[PDB]
């Protein structure tokens, strides 16, 4: 069918190296935009303003927004002082984010992952009916505009719609990067391509730290990560559109003039002459020829239910633990560059330890020993600095493996007439888990160390229930 007509016109050649690459550039800052509340809102010491004056903690250090009402008490009126020594500006240093408004720094960040939870759904249903290409060149725009609108916002609610409609934009590159990349590879190359992403992905912690080291003004670092998006919208109009969709479509015309237009690019332009209508109706006959199902058959409940707890428990553990970088007593610059280190050879474990055991033995130590790991470093006292890094930098790197895993167990148990819709509606809960996290996380006024335990309880119940899967192997 489809598959042959690729292989025909010159399989993975000189336009799919182009394409691939150009699609796949932008993911390098996608982590440097949802780790971004690392950088941009981080917390600096802050002693309250006088207007002898500030009472002491227990510890020894000046109580946080805390002033005694006449010299040697009373909140905090005149403002706060904070440290301009590691951090010149963050959003907590301009708005006052700091006592009375804890929460308002991890809501920023829920706020933000609602617009990836939204932009996946709404921009996922727009992709196939306005093409791949079309919605790809307006996901830039919005991604570089609405990103850019929030380094100069005001207000604290003009910053969480200028970020929230950034995040709308940005599920919409990663979901349809994978799709117009995927559509023109062959079939056989569709595994090796999702590996690349996530692979890519990683890469752009890197980067991340690496800028926000150089420029650690929010403004500006806000700005800078926003700016490159507008170069991905000037090229974005020299895009293929997916000869795919195109067919799925009806206009089989369009798909004609789509695979003409590779073969010059391959250089096999003697075999894309032979390509006519004729031929294209006749080959593409299966082509032209639901999640309720999901959700009625018995058999396919089983699977829904239970590959929704892996993808929300990976998900949900992975942000409660990559957004804490401050409590480590280690400089994030640092610790930043070795979460993204401990990325690669985590995953080469975890797809060593598939090829070799299996895919139920690799899910549950994948997610139980980031579950042990996230636990154990609750209980661990604070005194303890390299023994509590180290254990976060391994819970990290399992979490990290676990989503490889996940992702390809995701692609194998579901049949062929379903995959599409379970991995999409397998990711939709992996983005419900990104929004979970930081309100989880703000519970920690609550209880100090409340939010360790839940984000370790949560993959030690998910890993108690991958039993329930039927593995893969053969
Ligand atoms: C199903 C999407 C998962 N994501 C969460 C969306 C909010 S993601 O941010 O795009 C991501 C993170 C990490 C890795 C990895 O290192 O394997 C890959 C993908
Ligand atoms: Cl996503």
Redesign the pocket.
Known sequence: AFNDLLQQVGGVGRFQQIQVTLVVLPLLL?ASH?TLQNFTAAIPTHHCRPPVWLPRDRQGQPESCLRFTSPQTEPCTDGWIYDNSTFPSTIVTEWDLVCSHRALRQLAQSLY?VG?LLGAMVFGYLADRLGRRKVLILNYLQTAVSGTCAAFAPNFPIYCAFRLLSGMALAGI?LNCMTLNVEWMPIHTRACVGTLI?YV??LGQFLLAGVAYAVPHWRHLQLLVSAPFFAFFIYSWFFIESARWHSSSGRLDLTLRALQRVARINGKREEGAKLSMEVLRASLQKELTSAMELLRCPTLRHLFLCLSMLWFAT?FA?YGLVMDLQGFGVSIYLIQVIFGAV?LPA?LVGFLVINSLGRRPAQMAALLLAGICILLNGVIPQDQSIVRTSLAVLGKGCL?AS??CIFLYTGELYPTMIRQTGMGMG?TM??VG?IVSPLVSMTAELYPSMPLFIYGAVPVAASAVTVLLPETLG
Do not use: C
């Open positions: 996608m949802n992952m990836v990663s996530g992905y990683s998900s992975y990325d995953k990290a989503f490889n990711s992996a983005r990104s």
